[PDB]
Amino acid sequence: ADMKITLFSSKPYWVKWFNELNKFSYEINYVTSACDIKSVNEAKGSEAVCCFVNDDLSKEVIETLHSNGTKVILMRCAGFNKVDLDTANKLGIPVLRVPAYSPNAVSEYALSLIMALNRKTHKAHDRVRDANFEINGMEGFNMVSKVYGIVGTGNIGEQLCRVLKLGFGAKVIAYDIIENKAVTDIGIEYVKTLDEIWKQCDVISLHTPLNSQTKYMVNSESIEKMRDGVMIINVSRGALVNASDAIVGLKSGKISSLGMDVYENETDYFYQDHNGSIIKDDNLSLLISYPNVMITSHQAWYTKEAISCICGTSLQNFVDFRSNQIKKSNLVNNPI
Ligand SMILES: NC(=O)c1ccc[n+]([C@@H]2O[C@H](COP(=O)([O-])OP(=O)(O)OC[C@H]3O[C@@H](n4cnc5c(N)ncnc54)[C@H](O)[C@@H]3O)[C@@H](O)[C@H]2O)c1
């Protein structure tokens, strides 16, 4: 019990890294299933549980977890939108996240999606595999010929700004409620209203969190106000884009391409192999089938450095918990 971790939403990459980095003699119970009320029993007698972005740390499961001997929750990710902190606080349970995995991983993936919808290397790859070497349809653009707008000049945003403005010499505009200095210091200009981003930008990448303001940022109102042939990247939170609006945009031609590593109803799909079963989500089924849409299963973060840091940090969180030395930066809630 005292040294046992039950790790929910296990996959081979989790096992591989958590073992490699487990230098502290911890017993790890890897559960393939996700942490929901049907699964929370598997943690019985486990002092610590480790969860990921799509686990269900709801009031009831937390209560069960506490009523069965677990005392610390380990978020092996920086997000916690699905953890009822209040239940945890009242039960004296710390939740401990990994606030800082390499943001370059997410920014350079966002670039990846741009390059891919641009030069269409996947399309090329799918054709050549079928012995079709015709390149009609794969005309791209020089990177400097488009105006990139970044919404959210934070930790990931800032990086995408550097690589663009610095690596290609492109014209880059930012919209943010604050104003990251690193962005203004390399001659990138901020616009006061998003309405300017639409008017001026050819490819837009979103790097804000999801909140009552940013939700459905991309919708019919804004899509209409956008340029023709706009490319939209979104590797942040799926709900920044109203997918059915986005489809209308794509159908009517207003939107040239769409790249998303995240999706509003992603919880019932990502990370799992569901071949042979009908996706019942029609927007998601359609987006996947459209030929100018990149949809990937929330993997922008998955580099060697990011997952090494994630696992190593969660394990470290456990040892900190037990030496009563929790790092302020990793404690999300406030238990008694
Ligand atoms: N694997 C993945 O796909 C993955 C990995 C890490 C982070 N993310 C997502 O990327 C998003 C941002 O990442 P980050 O680490 O750079 O966060 P961050 O705190 O460093 O930056 C968030 C920025 O959004 C700015 N902003 C501008 N307008 C805003 C508005 N109207 N409402 C709220 N914020 C506004 C804020 O000032 C802030 O700087 C996160 O929401 C996170 O969910 C995805």
Side-chain angles (χ1 to χ4, degrees), residues 47-84:
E47 167 149 283
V49 302
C50 188
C51 292
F52 196 46
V53 130
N54 278 334
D55 288 301
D56 188 31
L57 299 187
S58 43
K59 193 181 182 195
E60 326 75 358
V61 329
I62 289 188
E63 296 179 320
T64 311
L65 279 170
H66 170 284
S67 308
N68 281 277
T70 101
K71 309 188 222 163
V72 56
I73 293 172
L74 305 183
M75 299 317 297
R76 60 165 186 295
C77 55
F80 42 105
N81 24 282
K82 303 166 64 71
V83 197
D84 187 341

Side-chain angles (χ1 to χ4, degrees), residues 101 106 152 154-157 175-178 207-211 214 235-237 261-262 298 300-301:
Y101 32 114
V106 181
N155 289 338
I156 297 185
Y175 177 81
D176 185 310
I177 58 183
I178 338 175
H207 299 292
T208 62
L210 169 50
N211 52 63
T214 51
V235 291
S236 291
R237 293 283 294 268
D261 179 50
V262 303
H298 196 149
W301 64 273

Side-chain angles (χ1 to χ4, degrees), residues 7 24 26 33 37 51 74 126 147 167 218 230 246-247 258 261 277 335:
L7 184 147
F24 326 90
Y26 290 146
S33 334
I37 192 78
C51 292
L74 305 183
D126 298 324
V147 163
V218 170
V230 50
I247 306 209
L258 183 64
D261 179 50
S277 296

Side-chain angles (χ1 to χ4, degrees), residues 115-294:
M115 309 269 140
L117 303 152
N118 187 336
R119 312 306 309 257
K120 300 175 202 174
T121 58
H122 57 297
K123 198 197 215 72
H125 168 72
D126 298 324
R127 273 181 201 192
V128 292
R129 292 209 83 234
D130 288 355
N132 172 9
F133 303 94
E134 172 72 292
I135 76 197
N136 189 30
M138 292 180 307
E139 168 167 324
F141 57 89
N142 289 359
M143 292 281 166
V144 160
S145 80
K146 304 298 214 172
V147 163
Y148 310 84
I150 304 305
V151 191
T153 73
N155 289 338
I156 297 185
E158 161 181 346
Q159 297 305 299
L160 187 64
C161 289
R162 304 174 96 259
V163 67
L164 298 193
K165 173 71 72 151
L166 294 174
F168 300 90
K171 195 209 173 189
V172 188
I173 320 190
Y175 177 81
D176 185 310
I177 58 183
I178 338 175
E179 263 205 24
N180 190 341
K181 194 73 179 185
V183 174
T184 93
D185 296 303
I186 60 176
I188 293 199
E189 62 165 324
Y190 282 81
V191 279
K192 287 189 177 175
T193 175
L194 265 177
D195 275 312
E196 266 163 310
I197 294 277
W198 317 136
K199 229 66 163 63
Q200 302 182 30
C201 298
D202 287 284
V203 345
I204 302 163
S205 193
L206 311 169
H207 299 292
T208 62
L210 169 50
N211 52 63
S212 197
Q213 296 86 233
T214 51
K215 185 185 171 182
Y216 286 160
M217 187 164 53
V218 170
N219 55 48
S220 285
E221 281 242 33
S222 50
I223 290 178
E224 151 60 351
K225 294 182 165 180
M226 298 181 161
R227 308 180 82 96
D228 299 331
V230 50
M231 186 191 290
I232 293 159
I233 304 327
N234 167 30
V235 291
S236 291
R237 293 283 294 268
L240 304 175
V241 181
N242 173 316
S244 71
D245 290 356
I247 306 209
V248 138
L250 292 156
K251 289 190 180 181
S252 79
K254 170 80 89 182
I255 304 192
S256 126
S257 350
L258 183 64
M260 292 206 302
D261 179 50
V262 303
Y263 175 66
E264 208 192 345
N265 304 351
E266 85 182 58
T267 52
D268 273 322
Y269 294 104
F270 286 15
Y271 297 131
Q272 303 304 331
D273 185 341
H274 291 306
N275 83 87
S277 296
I278 298 187
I279 300 183
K280 301 172 180 202
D281 191 341
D282 287 346
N283 289 335
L284 176 74
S285 234
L286 294 174
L287 286 165
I288 288 170
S289 70
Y290 291 168
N292 49 333
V293 183
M294 280 287 237

